[PDB]
Design an enzyme around this catalytic site. Sequence first.
Site, mmCIF file in Angstrom:
data_model
loop_
_atom_site.group_PDB
_atom_site.id
_atom_site.type_symbol
_atom_site.label_atom_id
_atom_site.label_comp_id
_atom_site.label_asym_id
_atom_site.label_seq_id
_atom_site.Cartn_x
_atom_site.Cartn_y
_atom_site.Cartn_z
ATOM 1 N N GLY A 36 71.713 62.310 46.425
ATOM 2 C CA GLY A 36 72.937 61.881 45.758
ATOM 3 C C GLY A 36 72.900 61.058 44.447
ATOM 4 N N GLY A 178 72.914 33.443 53.721
ATOM 5 C CA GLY A 178 71.653 34.236 54.281
ATOM 6 C C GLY A 178 70.345 33.813 53.767
ATOM 7 N N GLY A 179 69.359 33.586 54.486
ATOM 8 C CA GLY A 179 68.310 32.980 54.247
ATOM 9 C C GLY A 179 67.138 33.482 55.072
ATOM 10 C CD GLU A 201 70.060 31.675 58.321
ATOM 11 O OE1 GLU A 201 69.910 32.357 57.369
ATOM 12 O OE2 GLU A 201 70.047 31.968 59.410
ATOM 13 N NE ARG A 266 69.647 46.386 51.864
ATOM 14 C CZ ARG A 266 69.893 47.621 51.611
ATOM 15 N NH1 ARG A 266 69.328 48.581 52.387
ATOM 16 N NH2 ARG A 266 70.593 47.853 50.352
ATOM 17 C CG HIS A 437 32.349 29.807 46.668
ATOM 18 N ND1 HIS A 437 33.078 28.999 47.592
ATOM 19 C CD2 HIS A 437 32.555 29.052 45.487
ATOM 20 C CE1 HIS A 437 33.543 28.003 47.060
ATOM 21 N NE2 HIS A 437 33.215 27.979 45.874
HETATM 22 C C1 LIG Z 1 66.471 43.875 47.432
HETATM 23 C C2 LIG Z 1 65.640 44.331 48.473
HETATM 24 C C3 LIG Z 1 64.371 44.264 48.346
HETATM 25 C C4 LIG Z 1 63.411 45.007 49.203
HETATM 26 N N1 LIG Z 1 62.105 44.597 49.208
HETATM 27 C C5 LIG Z 1 61.483 45.336 49.884
HETATM 28 C C6 LIG Z 1 59.985 44.959 49.660
HETATM 29 O O1 LIG Z 1 59.327 44.472 48.780
HETATM 30 N N2 LIG Z 1 58.952 45.734 50.389
HETATM 31 C C7 LIG Z 1 59.493 46.606 51.517
HETATM 32 O O2 LIG Z 1 58.680 47.267 52.101
HETATM 33 N N3 LIG Z 1 60.705 46.716 51.622
HETATM 34 C C8 LIG Z 1 61.655 46.200 50.876
HETATM 35 N N4 LIG Z 1 62.942 46.486 50.961
HETATM 36 C C9 LIG Z 1 63.315 47.514 51.841
HETATM 37 C C10 LIG Z 1 64.226 48.790 51.707
HETATM 38 O O3 LIG Z 1 63.906 48.857 50.081
HETATM 39 C C11 LIG Z 1 63.657 49.997 52.480
HETATM 40 O O4 LIG Z 1 62.631 49.664 52.856
HETATM 41 C C12 LIG Z 1 63.503 51.404 51.474
HETATM 42 O O5 LIG Z 1 64.409 51.222 50.429
HETATM 43 C C13 LIG Z 1 63.657 52.345 52.718
HETATM 44 O O6 LIG Z 1 63.803 53.644 52.295
HETATM 45 P P1 LIG Z 1 64.361 54.606 52.985
HETATM 46 O O7 LIG Z 1 63.999 55.891 53.364
HETATM 47 O O8 LIG Z 1 65.258 54.320 54.316
HETATM 48 O O9 LIG Z 1 65.604 55.053 52.170
HETATM 49 P P2 LIG Z 1 66.574 54.346 50.989
HETATM 50 O O10 LIG Z 1 65.849 53.839 49.836
HETATM 51 O O11 LIG Z 1 67.311 53.454 51.376
HETATM 52 O O12 LIG Z 1 67.080 55.572 50.066
HETATM 53 C C14 LIG Z 1 67.928 56.655 50.936
HETATM 54 C C15 LIG Z 1 68.365 57.437 49.840
HETATM 55 O O13 LIG Z 1 69.134 58.339 50.381
HETATM 56 C C16 LIG Z 1 70.368 58.968 49.588
HETATM 57 N N5 LIG Z 1 71.675 59.292 50.158
HETATM 58 C C17 LIG Z 1 72.128 59.005 51.564
HETATM 59 N N6 LIG Z 1 72.716 60.012 52.142
HETATM 60 C C18 LIG Z 1 72.619 60.837 51.244
HETATM 61 C C19 LIG Z 1 73.222 62.111 51.447
HETATM 62 N N7 LIG Z 1 74.122 62.329 52.758
HETATM 63 N N8 LIG Z 1 73.043 63.002 50.690
HETATM 64 C C20 LIG Z 1 72.563 62.529 49.460
HETATM 65 N N9 LIG Z 1 71.790 61.432 49.113
HETATM 66 C C21 LIG Z 1 72.036 60.566 50.099
HETATM 67 C C22 LIG Z 1 70.846 57.549 49.056
HETATM 68 O O14 LIG Z 1 71.359 57.768 47.697
HETATM 69 C C23 LIG Z 1 69.253 56.844 49.007
HETATM 70 O O15 LIG Z 1 68.865 56.819 47.628
HETATM 71 C C24 LIG Z 1 63.941 46.012 49.880
HETATM 72 C C25 LIG Z 1 65.253 46.264 49.690
HETATM 73 C C26 LIG Z 1 66.092 45.346 49.204
HETATM 74 C C27 LIG Z 1 67.532 45.908 49.171
HETATM 75 C C1 LIG Z 2 29.020 28.511 35.439
HETATM 76 C C2 LIG Z 2 28.468 29.032 36.812
HETATM 77 C C3 LIG Z 2 29.612 29.531 37.618
HETATM 78 C C4 LIG Z 2 29.337 30.169 38.922
HETATM 79 N N1 LIG Z 2 30.316 30.807 39.265
HETATM 80 C C5 LIG Z 2 30.127 31.294 40.724
HETATM 81 C C6 LIG Z 2 30.817 31.986 41.399
HETATM 82 O O1 LIG Z 2 32.097 32.008 40.882
HETATM 83 N N2 LIG Z 2 30.820 32.507 42.469
HETATM 84 C C7 LIG Z 2 29.366 32.507 42.894
HETATM 85 O O2 LIG Z 2 29.255 32.928 44.167
HETATM 86 N N3 LIG Z 2 28.411 32.114 42.379
HETATM 87 C C8 LIG Z 2 28.736 31.486 41.141
HETATM 88 N N4 LIG Z 2 27.706 30.784 40.531
HETATM 89 C C9 LIG Z 2 26.575 30.701 41.331
HETATM 90 C C10 LIG Z 2 25.623 29.419 41.533
HETATM 91 O O3 LIG Z 2 26.544 28.295 41.366
HETATM 92 C C11 LIG Z 2 25.120 29.524 42.798
HETATM 93 O O4 LIG Z 2 25.546 30.688 43.387
HETATM 94 C C12 LIG Z 2 25.068 28.220 43.826
HETATM 95 O O5 LIG Z 2 25.355 27.083 43.027
HETATM 96 C C13 LIG Z 2 23.865 28.234 44.374
HETATM 97 O O6 LIG Z 2 23.619 27.545 45.212
HETATM 98 P P1 LIG Z 2 22.061 26.989 45.816
HETATM 99 O O7 LIG Z 2 21.821 26.886 47.331
HETATM 100 O O8 LIG Z 2 21.062 27.942 45.127
HETATM 101 O O9 LIG Z 2 22.034 25.507 45.105
HETATM 102 P P2 LIG Z 2 22.444 24.774 43.696
HETATM 103 O O10 LIG Z 2 23.888 24.593 43.825
HETATM 104 O O11 LIG Z 2 21.798 25.394 42.428
HETATM 105 O O12 LIG Z 2 21.824 23.346 44.059
HETATM 106 C C14 LIG Z 2 20.769 23.000 44.402
HETATM 107 C C15 LIG Z 2 20.610 21.518 44.420
HETATM 108 O O13 LIG Z 2 19.163 21.076 44.785
HETATM 109 C C16 LIG Z 2 19.148 20.000 44.154
HETATM 110 N N5 LIG Z 2 17.666 19.638 43.894
HETATM 111 C C17 LIG Z 2 16.664 20.448 43.317
HETATM 112 N N6 LIG Z 2 15.448 20.133 43.728
HETATM 113 C C18 LIG Z 2 15.617 18.783 44.373
HETATM 114 C C19 LIG Z 2 14.600 18.023 44.645
HETATM 115 N N7 LIG Z 2 13.448 18.526 44.744
HETATM 116 N N8 LIG Z 2 14.993 16.821 45.195
HETATM 117 C C20 LIG Z 2 16.233 16.427 45.395
HETATM 118 N N9 LIG Z 2 17.243 17.450 44.707
HETATM 119 C C21 LIG Z 2 16.969 18.491 44.284
HETATM 120 C C22 LIG Z 2 19.801 19.915 42.595
HETATM 121 O O14 LIG Z 2 20.176 18.842 42.101
HETATM 122 C C23 LIG Z 2 21.048 20.799 42.999
HETATM 123 O O15 LIG Z 2 22.301 20.276 43.202
HETATM 124 C C24 LIG Z 2 28.050 29.937 39.217
HETATM 125 C C25 LIG Z 2 26.994 29.598 38.551
HETATM 126 C C26 LIG Z 2 27.047 28.873 37.255
HETATM 127 C C27 LIG Z 2 26.299 27.995 36.535
#
Ligand SMILES: Cc1cc2nc3c(=O)[nH]c(=O)nc-3n(C[C@@H](O)[C@H](O)[C@H](O)COP(=O)(O)OP(=O)(O)OC[C@H]3O[C@@H](n4cnc5c(N)ncnc54)[C@H](O)[C@@H]3O)c2cc1C
Ligand SMILES: Cc1cc2nc3c(=O)[nH]c(=O)nc-3n(C[C@@H](O)[C@H](O)[C@H](O)COP(=O)(O)OP(=O)(O)OC[C@H]3O[C@@H](n4cnc5c(N)ncnc54)[C@H](O)[C@@H]3O)c2cc1C
Lengths: 458, 458
Positions: A36, A178-179, A201, A266, A437
């Site tokens: 439609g 409605g909440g 609500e 709805r 991590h």
């Molecule tokens: C504000 C809002 C937010 C939403 N957000 C989410 C979301 O984030 N995630 C989620 O999963 N769901 C959400 N929904 C869910 C909702 O959108 C439905 O899940 C989805 O639209 C269902 O699809 P449906 O198959 O029932 O058809 P609908 O999308 O309802 O559409 C059916 C169609 O049939 C048509 N129609 C009906 N009868 C006739 C006819 N006899 N001849 C020709 N055309 C006709 C209508 O014009 C319509 O477009 C939201 C709904 C609203 C209102």
């Molecule tokens: C900028 C940056 C970003 C990173 N981001 C990510 C991320 O986002 N995700 C990810 O998975 N990895 C990331 N890494 C990975 C990295 O952090 C390592 O994976 C992690 O730190 C390893 O841990 P480890 O067990 O080897 O020890 P480490 O953290 O290297 O620490 C070992 C510790 O042993 C101590 N030490 C050593 N010898 C002695 C000793 N003989 N006596 C006493 N103390 C001692 C040191 O002081 C140290 O603190 C990042 C690294 C860097 C530098």
Amino acid sequence: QQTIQTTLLIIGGGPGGYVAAIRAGQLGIPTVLVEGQALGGTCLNIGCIPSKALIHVAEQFHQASRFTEPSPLGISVASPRLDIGQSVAWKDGIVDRLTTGVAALLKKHGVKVVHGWAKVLDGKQVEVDGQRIQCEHLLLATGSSSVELPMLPLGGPVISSTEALAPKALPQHLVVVGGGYIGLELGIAYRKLGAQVSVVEARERILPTYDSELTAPVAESLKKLGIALHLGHSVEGYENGCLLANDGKGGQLRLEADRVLVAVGRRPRTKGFNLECLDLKMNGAAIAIDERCQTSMHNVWAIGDVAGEPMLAHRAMAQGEMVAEIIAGKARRFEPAAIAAVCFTDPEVVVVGKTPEQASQQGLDCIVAQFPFAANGRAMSLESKSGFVRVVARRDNHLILGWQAVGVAVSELSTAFAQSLEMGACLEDVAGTIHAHPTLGEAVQEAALRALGHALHI
Amino acid sequence: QQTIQTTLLIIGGGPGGYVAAIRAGQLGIPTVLVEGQALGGTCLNIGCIPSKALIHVAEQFHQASRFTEPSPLGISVASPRLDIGQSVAWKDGIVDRLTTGVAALLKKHGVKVVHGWAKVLDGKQVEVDGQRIQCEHLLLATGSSSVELPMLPLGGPVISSTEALAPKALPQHLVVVGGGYIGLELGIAYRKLGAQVSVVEARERILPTYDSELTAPVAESLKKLGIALHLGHSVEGYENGCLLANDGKGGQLRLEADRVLVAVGRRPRTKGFNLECLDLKMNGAAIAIDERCQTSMHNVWAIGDVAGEPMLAHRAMAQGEMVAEIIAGKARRFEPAAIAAVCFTDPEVVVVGKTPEQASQQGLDCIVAQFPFAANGRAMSLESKSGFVRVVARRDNHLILGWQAVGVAVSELSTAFAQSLEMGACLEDVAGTIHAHPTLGEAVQEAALRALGHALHI
Ligand SMILES: Cc1cc2nc3c(=O)[nH]c(=O)nc-3n(C[C@@H](O)[C@H](O)[C@H](O)COP(=O)(O)OP(=O)(O)OC[C@H]3O[C@@H](n4cnc5c(N)ncnc54)[C@H](O)[C@@H]3O)c2cc1C
Ligand SMILES: Cc1cc2nc3c(=O)[nH]c(=O)nc-3n(C[C@@H](O)[C@H](O)[C@H](O)COP(=O)(O)OP(=O)(O)OC[C@H]3O[C@@H](n4cnc5c(N)ncnc54)[C@H](O)[C@@H]3O)c2cc1C
Ligand SMILES: NC(=O)c1ccc[n+]([C@@H]2O[C@H](COP(=O)([O-])OP(=O)(O)OC[C@H]3O[C@@H](n4cnc5c(N)ncnc54)[C@H](O)[C@@H]3O)[C@@H](O)[C@H]2O)c1
Ligand SMILES: NC(=O)c1ccc[n+]([C@@H]2O[C@H](COP(=O)([O-])OP(=O)(O)OC[C@H]3O[C@@H](n4cnc5c(N)ncnc54)[C@H](O)[C@@H]3O)[C@@H](O)[C@H]2O)c1
């Protein structure tokens, strides 16, 4: 004008419809889709994409707004301005690109898409603006519509989701009746955009479907954000410039609001087209369907919102594709392990599978374990918005039954939760997987380590 | 001062060390940890958390900076200012909270933590500032250090990661010798904070470990961001206010830089403490270890960076906990299905499992499928930063061998990629899982649907 005659006729071109089409075009069943209004449906045009896209521009306005006040990050900006015309034009481009693309793939797989409304004539023919159309299998995907309140007709000032997703100006005080996810996602977004907001609500609390452990983080942010929360109140009227709500026995509340947004639920779209001419068994306001998405009239099929049950897009998309394959011969039955639910509230809630509540109701003995984001490095890089991850597992074989999470940027953990459940993972397989991590999903490995008795950072 | 005598002595208190400790305290093995500098290690103090936290404040400065120019979002702000003192003070609070918490859990599980450097005396005793300490199992987790360039000693102007994570002022032009994750994550962050940046790298391209399909999105953003990219050049000097690099045969380049950041690699920390007194077999600059993390001298164990191999925190954390359990009786062997790698570049790259390259080298016939974010609604709500998701699977049984992804907010898909691989999923199980709309992980279900021959939105 003459009879179009097909094998599969689909009523409705939203999520359920266009994917039943695309896979039936793909599988090579002669297919026609009636629509439609515009393709994609509620999700693409006035649901899914325009809400999440308004939420995003609200987030970017809010984050540059906080920098007028001192922040521990040391960033400072003057004069944050938002004239929402452009936010909406932006939103509209995205909806546009996506509807366009759905036409392309429907053309590509060659399904005939006919516009206009369809009035059903029988479980085989349909009339769309004059021409009859016949078929062997009728699939209905008519969708859902928003419940209107009797003393509060929409019109002007009382808008519904559809119009909230479409300002030309923002409210001074908006009240939200409605909440649930629609009211909250929109309310938070109205507040970050700069409008005053109150949520009213009728139950104990916000997101009353969900337990208070989970929902409590969201409540605290609304309260932090300046969003008043009149729970226990029901709405009775809007005396032109003022809203009145009462709490059950006797309570008051006169909120001077100049926009109200009813987001009270709805309903399945079953009326206004002649669905009533057919012998279909019902389930309240919705069409009853079996696990093969078929109605009580043999080659008639129902999917998505018209089938009520959980009203979400991915549910519809997944019922569409399954119906298509059954008509083409493949043996199927919709029994997913779970249907992931996500609310793009601040913070985001994600529930996938059984809650503790639900596990108790069905009489299961559970390990329920939780790991919070205050003990999580990634969360701290991100200014946290603390919440937790929770796991629910069978105390006898640790088979995971569900997953729930609350926090900033949590929405993407749903992919992990759903697939671990589709595979039948136990706490062990999750815990014994190296998680990278620093990520928020380290909390998922730790919440499973804790249930087992040996967590490392809590 | 008298002999401390334990069962498990651990040299080093970073990721590998404190989790070998915490699980050995937990399992009840008498444990002592020596730590020269401060707990948590490189990750917590000068790696992991302070880099990802500077990247976050750089993102928030950049996003309020873009709003001085017109945006399609309609938001406008004047006067974005960043005085990085506060950004760093912020960063330092977080590192502080996390080291503190590691002490708490080490106290809680009762391990004695002794400070000072440890000079090894034999594979049983150690001397830490005077007192000898003896033990039954020695676990080394000494870590890694940054490779210094001979004609370019660190000092002032030539800083390394550690000092880049610690400005009191930002550079006018910073040059970055090395275009691996450290150089790029820091370079992008220096540019968004407002400094001019050039990356000089001695190979064909940025992230030379990774294929050009994947790495190409990052390149384009650096180029979009104003970050010059002198590939094919090697650095030979810094003639006080100017840097000189040459390209192999004969090329020039005089870049006037007033800060250079050598990020040319990381070496195992094997020297400066008497490790050389022991009969240990080597593997280049690193200690050789078997699958039980044991060195060639029986009750001596090595984990994390000192064992070289993939130099990442979660690898160390996971080798620590496994050693602890082996000493306490449990039979184990480190054979993870994959070690997830993440780069918090803009966009983010995530590689988990085999790349196509790698699958070819090992002689496998592969389905390799990809699904892009321009065909993804969530990505569009988010202003995209287009890239894709790629899957690699056995053409005969669709057993998934790896996962790679490039894009905005992709880091959290790693949890899903790792667990699907830990479970032994095939394309089918991923594709047949309902993924929630609108999320970026819809791209993971579609990239698996495409490999199977039936994608819906591409
Ligand atoms: C504000 C809002 C937010 C939403 N957000 C989410 C979301 O984030 N995630 C989620 O999963 N769901 C959400 N929904 C869910 C909702 O959108 C439905 O899940 C989805 O639209 C269902 O699809 P449906 O198959 O029932 O058809 P609908 O999308 O309802 O559409 C059916 C169609 O049939 C048509 N129609 C009906 N009868 C006739 C006819 N006899 N001849 C020709 N055309 C006709 C209508 O014009 C319509 O477009 C939201 C709904 C609203 C209102
Ligand atoms: C900028 C940056 C970003 C990173 N981001 C990510 C991320 O986002 N995700 C990810 O998975 N990895 C990331 N890494 C990975 C990295 O952090 C390592 O994976 C992690 O730190 C390893 O841990 P480890 O067990 O080897 O020890 P480490 O953290 O290297 O620490 C070992 C510790 O042993 C101590 N030490 C050593 N010898 C002695 C000793 N003989 N006596 C006493 N103390 C001692 C040191 O002081 C140290 O603190 C990042 C690294 C860097 C530098
Ligand atoms: N309606 C259904 O059968 C059904 C089924 C599954 C999911 N849902 C979801 O509901 C969505 C539409 O609404 P929602 O997000 O608000 O969810 P919802 O239907 O659960 O919530 C509506 C909220 O308004 C409250 N309420 C009712 N009348 C009120 C009043 N007069 N004054 C104040 N508060 C009042 C209700 O308690 C409820 O909390 C759909 O898009 C769908 O995703 C609905
Ligand atoms: N060094 C190892 O054995 C090892 C092992 C596994 C992982 N890593 C990772 O490497 C990290 C440390 O460095 P990185 O992120 O830069 O990675 P890296 O060691 O892969 O990259 C260093 C980069 O500098 C380039 N280069 C070398 N000399 C140069 C010069 N003179 N001028 C210009 N370019 C030059 C190299 O080609 C390389 O691209 C560690 O934290 C670890 O995560 C290292």
